[PDB]
Design a protein around this ligand. Structure first.
Ligand code: SF4
Lengths: 89, 50, 49, 49, 77, 49
């Protein structure tokens, strides 16, 4: 039959802000004291990380950025890139 | 010396044949509003904890 | 004189769908520390109208 | 020996030495990354470099 | 469209194990049955399964499409 | 001989209500690393009765 207790809630939503009623607002990261006073970006990683915990990232334009290193290895090089020009002295 | 502005120096010691030495210069902001000077003279400046 | 010879086989494990860059540097003029690599790349190919 | 130019934070000096070859090419002899302004080389041979 | 309990970037990057399906559009295998849930030879299509380890790829002669980077020692060394 | 002469202008931007200290050191006897500056200062002038 009747459907009582509508309990309009237009007032309650504004209590947290009005700009949030049209925009979810961007999330912000936390500040680590150990990382001096630098502010972490949520959409750029200049430092080159380690390929393990960090998920395979995604790029969307420009941004000279680092990477996730998969294999680092140091050995002894060859004397000569190619061809017959192989002088040493 | 305290008051509102102060300066101090120590005698430079070098010479011993013509050379060229570096000079690091840095500005530091400590606090806000009218502060007081160091408890003692120029000694209060601690470089590498000395 | 002739010394040991070495037969080497490279990696056959191709990377299916991940962008990768392999860099080899003599690393003589670099310092005892590591070297940071940055790459000024473009974006990802998207499906556009 | 040289002087220290305008600098931010801190600097090091990287110096390399090359030797002109007989045909006209170049040969690199060593390299050094240092902090002191003055450097010294010892036991050099051949001619121009 | 509800997005409860989901994470955006859905890759594990690397492990000792593969991280895809079997006979999908990324594994790219279409041959006869050779292996099962474990590392046991078989020749029936009903029990075709891949352990998603290196041994499975060696069995199926398809290693270039393996989704596990063989680092291991980057975490140790 | 005469060499290049340089006309230099200092900072005209003064700091209105911030305490500051400027320190210049030859930085030769120090190590290649940076130097930490700690200052032993008093407190702030308050509106005491
Ligand atoms: S392991 Fe090799 S075979 Fe088994 S699924 Fe991943 S890719 Fe296809």
């Amino acid at each position: 039959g009747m459907t009582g207790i509508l309990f309009s809630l237009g007032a309650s939503m504004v209590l947290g802000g009005v700009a949030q009623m049209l925009a979810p607002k961007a999330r912000t990261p936390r500040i680590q004291t150990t990382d001096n006073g630098k502010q972490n970006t949520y959409f750029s990683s200049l430092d080159n990380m380690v390929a393990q915990g960090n998920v395979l990232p995604v790029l969307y334009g420009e941004m000279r950025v680092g990477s996730r290193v998969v294999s680092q290895e140091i050995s002894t090089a060859d004397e000569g890139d190619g061809g017959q020009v192989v002088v040493i002295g | 010396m305290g008051k509102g502005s102060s300066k101090g120096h120590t005698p430079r010691e070098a010479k011993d044949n013509l050379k060229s030495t570096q000079l690091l210069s840095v500005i530091d902001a400590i606090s806000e509003g009218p502060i007081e000077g160091p408890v003692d003279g120029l000694k209060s400046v601690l470089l590498n904890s000395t | 004189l002739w010394s040991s010879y070495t037969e080497i086989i490279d990696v056959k494990q191709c990377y299916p769908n991940t962008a990768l860059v392999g860099v080899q540097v003599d690393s003589e003029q670099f310092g005892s520390q590591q070297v940071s690599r940055n790459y000024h790349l473009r974006g990802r190919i998207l499906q556009v109208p | 020996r040289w002087d220290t130019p305008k600098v931010v934070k801190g600097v090091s000096f990287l110096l390399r030495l090359t030797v002109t070859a007989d045909d006209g090419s170049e040969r690199l002899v060593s390299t050094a990354r240092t902090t002191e302004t003055t450097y010294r080389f010892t036991q050099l041979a051949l001619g121009n470099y | 469209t509800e997005t409860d309990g989901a994470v955006f970037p859905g890759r594990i990057m690397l492990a000792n194990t593969c991280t895809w399906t079997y006979r999908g559009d990324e594994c790219g295998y279409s041959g006869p049955a050779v292996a099962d849930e474990y590392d046991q030879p078989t020749s029936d299509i009903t029990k075709d399964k891949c352990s998603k380890c290196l041994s499975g790829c060696k069995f199926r002669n398809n290693v270039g499409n393996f989704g596990g980077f063989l680092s291991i020692n980057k975490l140790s060394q």
